[model samples]
Target: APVVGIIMGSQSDFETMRHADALLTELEIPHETLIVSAHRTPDRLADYARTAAERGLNVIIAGAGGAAHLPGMCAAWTRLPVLGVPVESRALKGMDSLLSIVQMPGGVPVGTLAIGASGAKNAALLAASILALYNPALAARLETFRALQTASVPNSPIT
Candidate 1:
């Protein structure tokens, strides 16, 4: 079963979003990626967000540049947890993208991450963490991975 749904506003965003894809793959999580624009293709976003849970998706990762509304719109349309990745922008350096996604009003909620590849990578990691809540084996794997990550960090400060 597909546990995560990774979507972006356009194919150009793929370079950044691919980090999420790679991380999910490393975790052995079943996920699918797609290009579904909030501005260019609202209907597709609506349909995708609405049916995602029924289609076996536990979390949705939406990445977009410029005025990034894809993540907020996905949250509005679906009950699943939405993690927003702000793709770096040519004009505003992704400040517009970050604000647009992170500034969602009272009710609708999207967990916004840092701009660009780091954001994309964390979105997948967050998605996996969410899934690990229910799956014991996954929980163990995630814990081991986290321990390894911690161990890999050098104790000495960098000059």
Candidate 2:
């Protein structure tokens, strides 16, 4: 069953969103990824977020560029925790996207990340950590996941 839902504003966001997807898979977390633009398809966005919990989704990771209301809207319709990743844009390099997501008003909270791939990767890791609160198996996997990353680092930069 899919526990995490990954929603992007457009297909072009896949380059950034894919990091979240890959990290979730690497941690053995079950997740689903889809494109749902809040501007282009408002009804679609509402339906998906409103029913996300009913559909058994625990968390939602939303990525978008430009106006980037995708994550804020997702949080509005759903009680599920929403992690926002700002996709880098050619115009402003994602500063616009980051500001849009993080500037969301009170009572509608979106856990916002930085811009681009690093943001996407951390969003999934954050979701994994959230789920690990109740999932022992996932906790164990995440533990090793972090450990191995630390283990893989080189002791010296030069010979």
Candidate 3:
């Protein structure tokens, strides 16, 4: 059973979304990945989101460029936590994707991250953080991860 469900609009998005997978793997968090487009495969998105909870998924991370409605739609379909990763678009450099995802209606909430690779990484970390709220061991590991991240920063910028 996977704790995190990573979905992207297309396989092309995987290049960026894989950062989430990598971090989740490093953290030893079980997760599954899928390419389900909200526009092209609405039914697939609906089914995935509808049954995700029953299938043992704790959180969902959706990445999409262009219109970028996947995350919001996923949130609409599932009560589970949804984090949106805006895949950078060649045309707008992901500003469109970012705005499309972040500007959700008042009631529904899709926690949006920065655009592209770093966003994908942070989405996984955020998902892990969310899960850590209930798991002590995972929480400890997350703290250590954060400590390492903090330690990695030097007093002065290195060339």
Q: lDDT values of the candidates?
A: 0.95, 0.95, 0.96
The candidate scoring highest on lDDT is 3
Considering only N, C-alpha and C atoms within 3 Å, which residue pairs clash in candidate 1?
none
> Candidate 1 lDDT, tens digit per residue, 103-146?
99999999999999999999999988999999998899899889
Summarize candidate 2's per-residue lDDT along 1-159 as a digit string, tens digits.
899999998889999999999999988898999999999999999999999999999999999999889999999999999999999999999999999999988899999988999999999999999999999999999999999999999988976
What's the lDDT of the predicted structure labeled candidate 1? 0.95
TM-score of every prediction relative to native: 0.96, 0.97, 0.97
Q: Is 1 or 2 the stronger prediction by lDDT?
A: 2
lDDT of 1 at 24: 92
Superposed model 3: Cα runs more than 4 Å off: none
lDDT of 3 at 26: 94
Total colliding residue pairs, candidate 3? 0
